Design a binder for these strands. Sequence first.
DNA 1: CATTAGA
DNA 2: TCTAATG
Length: 327
Amino acid sequence: ETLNGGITDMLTELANFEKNVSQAIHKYNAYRKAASVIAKYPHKIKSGAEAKKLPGVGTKIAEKIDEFLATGKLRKLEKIRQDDTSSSINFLTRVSGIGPSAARKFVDEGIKTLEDLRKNEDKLNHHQRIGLKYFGDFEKRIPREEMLQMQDIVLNEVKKVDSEYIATVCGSFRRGAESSGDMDVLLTHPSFTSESTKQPKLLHQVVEQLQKVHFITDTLSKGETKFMGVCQLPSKNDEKEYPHRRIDIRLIPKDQYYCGVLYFTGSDIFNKNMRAHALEKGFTINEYTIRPLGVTGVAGEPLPVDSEKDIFDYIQWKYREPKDRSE
DNA sequence: CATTAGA
DNA sequence: TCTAATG
Ligand code: NA
Ligand code: NA
């Protein structure tokens, strides 16, 4: 957590590189496992040698460990950090819609900057065109103070269209957080569950609501169960307009909400931890359900859930307010 | 890890 | 169809 820190950070750096700039999935994978196991090790790595005794700890990495050990740096590291191409990749990527493959392709074409991107919006797809267009706003945080004003409008039209809907704004937001990166709305309806053959319109109804009022401004992706978009709080009585925000609304079988909700609400550690417990408590948790464990090794059969409580009850735990779902 | 664009 | 990008 700190005694192995540099090694881990170097190593990760190392990894992320291969992965993006290069297409070295393996080396990349190689770095991460090492990064992983070195991270667990309970003592101070005093040399590649010692490190080397590890699993996944090859000669190539052990080598890198000495160089970092001996001199507070690493060339390859330094050389990469410098590399204008590589850098270019890492940057283009911040564009929403641009990922490794497109980064590399763009670079090769010579587009290495934000401006380059503009000059060639045509070589860009609708997702990326938007990612472009709100480059700033998308990197900006979301003040809870806004999360509250957004959430408020959202539940308002949800309810407006049909009183039967159930929306929940999951995430850290939900976990009390001072700010958030984007809003996650988990949606559900009774008239939609596990079997009941969809009702695409269920999703489409609301998206169209939000839009009709202007909360929705753009569509990154709209599928029959997951709409991915852009939204903005009405810019008041002037002088202050609102930054464009990333929103994600998703349909859910009324039969799977709470688990999903429970889940997406994290924290990643709270979940992991609760989940690990359900195992002892003879259970199985996962994004959509909770099944009872059968000694044969495994088992099935989705116990019924009506609230975040059921799932609690089931594993016989203390209901944890989302507030304290930190870990 | 599953859903969507796109070509 | 596959392949990429988000979460
Ligand atoms: Na080894
Ligand atoms: Na990106």
